[PDB]
Amino acid sequence: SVGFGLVYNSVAEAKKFEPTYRLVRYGLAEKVEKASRQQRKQKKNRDKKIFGTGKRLAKKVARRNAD
Amino acid sequence: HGSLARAGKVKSQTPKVEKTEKPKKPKGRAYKRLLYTRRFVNVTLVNGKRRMNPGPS
């Protein structure tokens, strides 16, 4: 079997030059938990649908629900 | 003339028969070897025209 096998100078340089997929496959980093792309884009759409933080929106929702 | 019927008369009235029992014959490579052995190296029937599937007589 022949494959791309390579070495770095040190572990810190390895971490600074390798992306997280290689890091998690080599145990150099922890597998961070990410949401599905559809849901992340859905929330990217929702926070664009609403303008700003939405505190005034929550206040208005409470005012309307009080009716 | 008014014959929109009687379709498949022979299909109806011939007896339904199944093939006689026989083990599956060789297929493919073994089949072509049997063809070679019965066609080239067989001197059995080269009488006048070297028949291929001579009917019984």
Partner: protein, 144 residues
Amino acid sequence: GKGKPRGLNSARKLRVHRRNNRWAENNYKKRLLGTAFKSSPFGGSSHAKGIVLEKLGIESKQPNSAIRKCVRVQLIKNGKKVTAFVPNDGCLNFVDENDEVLLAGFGRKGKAKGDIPGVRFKVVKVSGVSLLALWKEKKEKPRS
């Protein structure tokens, strides 16, 4: 001699004459006129679906004695009534009426095949099942 012009500057004459006389070819004329798009029941298509209407017991031409049990079919895209042959045995009994048939040509680019007049198409399916698989009982006609 030999008719046609031979001059080095006669190319336009040769080309125009070839066009005029190429018009005399049967398939060239049909292909450029688009008779398959304006006059053909199939509209230049390889196949067409159909709804069978009734049965015809048109007899066979001489020297022969038989009927060829065709079906009258209304097309779906063209709205045209055609007479299509159903090849196999009992196929009339299988497409008695109102079934969903699939129709193709007959093998002679729009001519009657044998001793059957006025039929130029034949069926290759009935509502999803093939006529010969139906004939060999590998599959069964869907009543639903």
